[PDB]
Design a protein around this ligand. Structure first.
Ligand code: MG
Ligand code: MG
Ligand code: ZN
Lengths: 136, 130, 38, 362, 135
RNA sequence: AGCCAGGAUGUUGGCUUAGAAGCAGCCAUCAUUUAAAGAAAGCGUAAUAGCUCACUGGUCGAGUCGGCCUGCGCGGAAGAU
């Protein structure tokens, strides 16, 4: 489960998740799973996806996780009223914009890679798509 | 397979026909692979690798290469059949071999048509140079 | 009869057919395989 | 080639010993009957039986086959030994030597499997030595035993570690726990569990009478401490309801109280300490977990109790060796092997007993 | 008609433990097959398995035609090793030269389907590779 | 797309296994007779056997296959007078 080792700050503002993503292209691998939807992947979710895809690829070929859950999300404890400071950090998310290459993969046949990505995709909350290495 | 390979195959077949005048038939409408293998091995024993049973007797495959040489072979087309081109020796004895094979379990599929070399009938010709 | 939200061809013999506006997997081979969207 | 000859001589002897321990003829007979059963076509109609019979067969066959291989190989080597000696052909000699080595290895393998067939035999052990009813003498005896064990363990290459030592007020030790790490440590030591009989004139007695003092050894393997598994919400029923007495308007309405129930076992935990239902559930959950743990412990204990009860049933048979120092003779009661070198045994020559015990399977 | 290849070594007269019910499944008796095997054996060699056609006729008197012994055992014999399959590409257990393989090929020519001995040799090489031994 | 035929050889590849013969796995994944036939995709077996499939030959005689892009719809879709 991915999480920042150190932090500058323990809690964080909600913020907004508008715009298009920057990590848009398949950089390292041959194939990628590009996020079509807007949302936020938790660390847990990402880990699950990784687990799904590694198994599918049967420990053959490399996987990159292009996303990182660097934003802490707070949850107020149950049966607790609305005041009294900010809630405690429960889980960590990567905020996802459309265009985000989430995962990358190489050293695999194409069909197999596709299959793996499909398997992964069902674990993630956002709508996603298979993408390829492009010259330029 | 793409067009080019098919064309090449056709050319090869044509070349084979040009090389060898005598020919005979066989058919596997109920034929064991082992028998076929044995038959193939016979050819090897006799002479070179040249001879193939060439199952490609479609309406526009061997029948398309028929206008080049032995023009009567077009009517053979619309049936399950397998040709056998014979290169060395003037009228070899592989024609009756097929008949023999048929006799030893093949359930009369080809009906030993002959391929007409001295313009022969449907019936066999034992009269062959030895 | 597996009534599901996702119906899929589970083998070669599985065929997807639509009957009175309902998606259905019917299979000639395996009776287990036959499905309905619901 | 004299050492080679000696080795050859040894090997036949050990093969014979192995046969004796195995009871080879009976095994062969069993193999034969099983084989006969096998070929009868009616036996494969019953599937459960047949697979079991097959399983039985194979091991027996292996045992038999290896045995005569050993008989034959040795003979071959002996035949070739002459050639090596008189004719002086070197390559042939070398070949013979190689064959012998192979045969030896095979023998070892067979003996290994005969010995260390148990589940925990490869693992390391905790040897526990306890002094008997005697007093000072008993304590001394226990100490002696401990020393002997240490010497033995050092000898073969095991790592000893004195975990706990209760020291005797006058001399020796009241009790000791020794962790013995190494390859097949428990398998080598498991036979030494039991009561040891010292017979000697007591140096601590003022009268100087000849005492029969006892001290127990107890070898148990270091089991891997299994993680206490998280119970599934599928196995659980969570009831929520109103509290007893309560006391107010909000209390009458609110269902804070939690009853967690284990479906497979039938244990219940109630909690209604907190106002918050969630908190109660958490507390109740904890309680349930604790209860489960307790149950697990109880079950473990019960099984353990059965085991010793069975062990108790043997009674006087727990006495495994008799160390007579006056007449100068050690006897293993289980096997029947005797030696007059008592001092040597004390120093740590237990291999002669232990190996035989292992071969026996007791 | 009920033809199946299932037998152990030629020297082992009447295969009781391994084959058993498989040989005596049909109407033909246990003793006959064994006798036939014995008869076959004396002309060539003992110790190796040899496969044979089991055409079980209604008259009981079966027609049988022998085949060449399995290739794997021959390969093993050539090697001088017993087991060489456990993790072959991770670590090479045994190794054979091409000439030896070629030699092996020639002897089996009667039962092998083909005219070219080179073909046979390459088949044998492939078999060896499969087994675990690197050429 | 139907339909008729073949769908083999070394070979049951070895091992480890109780047994393993394409199909418990672990691993190599070759070559052969060549029209084509995986040391095997599914069913099947105590395991073999057996039944399919891949690819291919024959018949038949015009379009066909499955991705992408989008428009509109379908299921997913249960509550209390
Ligand atoms: Mg940004
Ligand atoms: Mg809708
Ligand atoms: Zn189906």
């Amino acid at each position: 489960m991915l999480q920042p080792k150190r932090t500058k700050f323990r809690k964080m503002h909600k913020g907004r998740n508008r715009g298009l993503a920057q990590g848009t292209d398949v950089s390292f691998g041959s194939f990628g799973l590009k996020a079509v939807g807007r949302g936020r992947l938790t660390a847990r979710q990402i880990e699950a996806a990784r687990r799904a895809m590694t198994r599918a690829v049967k420990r053959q070929g490399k996987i990159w996780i292009r996303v990182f859950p660097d934003k802490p999300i707070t949850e107020k404890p149950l049966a607790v009223r609305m005041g009294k400071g900010k809630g405690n950090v429960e889980y960590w998310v990567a905020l996802i914009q459309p265009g985000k290459v989430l995962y990358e993969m190489d050293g695999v046949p194409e069909e197999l890679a596709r299959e793996a990505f499909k398997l992964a995709a069902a674990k993630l909350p956002i709508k996603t798509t298979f993408v390829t290495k492009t010259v330029m | 397979a793409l067009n080019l390979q098919d064309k090449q195959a056709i050319v090869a077949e044509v070349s084979e026909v040009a090389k060898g005048a005598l020919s005979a038939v066989v058919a596997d409408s109920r034929g064991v692979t082992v028998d076929k293998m044995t038959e193939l091995r016979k050819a090897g024993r006799e002479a070179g690798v040249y001879m193939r049973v060439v199952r490609n007797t479609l309406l526009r495959r061997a029948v398309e290469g028929t206008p080049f040489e032995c023009l009567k072979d077009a009517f053979v087309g619309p049936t399950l059949i397998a040709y056998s081109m014979e290169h060395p020796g003037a009228a070899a004895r592989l024609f009756k071999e097929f008949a023999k094979a048929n006799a030893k379990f093949e359930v009369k599929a080809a009906a030993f048509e002959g391929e007409l070399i001295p313009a022969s009938q449907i019936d066999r010709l034992a009269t062959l140079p030895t | 009869m597996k009534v599901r939200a996702s119906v899929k061809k589970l083998c070669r013999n599985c065929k997807i057919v639509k009957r009175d506006g309902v998606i259905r997997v019917i299979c000639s081979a395996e009776p287990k395989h036959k499905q309905r969207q619901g | 080639i004299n050492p080679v000859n000696n080795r050859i001589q040894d090997l036949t002897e050990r093969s014979d010993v192995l046969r004796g321990y195995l009871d080879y003829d009976a095994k062969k007979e069993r193999l034969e009957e099983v084989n006969a059963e096998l070929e009868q076509p009616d036996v494969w109609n019953e599937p459960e039986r047949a697979q079991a019979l097959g399983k039985e067969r194979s091991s027996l066959e292996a045992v038999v086959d290896t045995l005569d291989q050993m008989k034959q190989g040795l003979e071959d080597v002996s035949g070739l030994l002459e050639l090596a000696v008189e004719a002086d052909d070197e390559e042939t000699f070398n070949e013979a030597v190689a064959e012998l080595d192979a045969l030896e290895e095979k023998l070892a393998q067979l003996e290994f499997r005969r010995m260390f067939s148990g589940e925990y035999d490869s693992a390391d052990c905790y040897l526990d030595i306890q002094a008997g009813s005697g007093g000072t003498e008993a304590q001394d005896w226990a100490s002696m035993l401990e020393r002997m064990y240490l010497r033995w363990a050092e000898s073969r290459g095991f790592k000893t570690e004195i975990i706990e030592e209760s020291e005797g007020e006058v001399a020796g030790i009241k009790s000791v726990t020794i962790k013995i790490s190494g390859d097949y440590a428990y398998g080598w030591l498991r036979t030494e569990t039991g009561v040891h009989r010292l017979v000697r004139k007591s140096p601590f007695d003022s009268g100087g009478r000849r005492h029969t003092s006892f001290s127990s050894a107890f070898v148990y393997p270091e089991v891997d401490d299994d993680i206490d598994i998280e119970i599934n919400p599928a196995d659980l029923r969570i009831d929520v309801y109103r509290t007893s007495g309560a006391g107010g308007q909000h209390v009458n309405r609110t269902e804070s109280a939690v009853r967690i129930t284990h479906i497979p076992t039938g244990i219940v935990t109630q909690c209604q300490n907190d106002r918050s239902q969630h908190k109660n559930k958490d507390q109740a959950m904890k309680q349930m977990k604790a209860k489960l743990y307790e149950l697990e412990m109880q079950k473990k204990n019960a099984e353990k109790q059965a085991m010793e009860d069975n062990k108790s049933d043997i009674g006087w048979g727990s006495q495994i060796r008799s160390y007579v120092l006056d007449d100068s003779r050690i006897k293993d009661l289980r096997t029947g092997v005797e030696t007059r070198n008592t001092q040597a045994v004390l120093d740590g020559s237990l291999d002669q007993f232990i190996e035989a015990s292992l071969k026996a399977g007791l | 008609q009920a033809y199946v290849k299932l037998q152990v070594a030629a020297g082992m007269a009447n295969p009781s433990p391994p084959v058993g019910p498989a040989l005596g499944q049909q109407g033909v008796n246990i003793m006959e097959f064994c006798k036939a095997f014995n008869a076959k054996t004396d002309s060539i060699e003992k110790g190796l398995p040899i496969p044979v056609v089991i055409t079980v006729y209604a008259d009981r008197s079966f027609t049988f035609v022998t085949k060449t012994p399995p290739a794997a055992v021959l390969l093993k014999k050539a090697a001088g090793i017993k087991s060489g399959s456990g993790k072959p590409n991770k670590d090479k257990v045994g190794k054979i030269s091409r000439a030896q393989l070629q030699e092996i090929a020639q002897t089996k020519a009667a039962d092998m389907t083909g005219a070219d001995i080179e073909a046979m040799t390459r088949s044998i090489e492939g078999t060896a590779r499969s087994m675990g031994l690197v050429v």
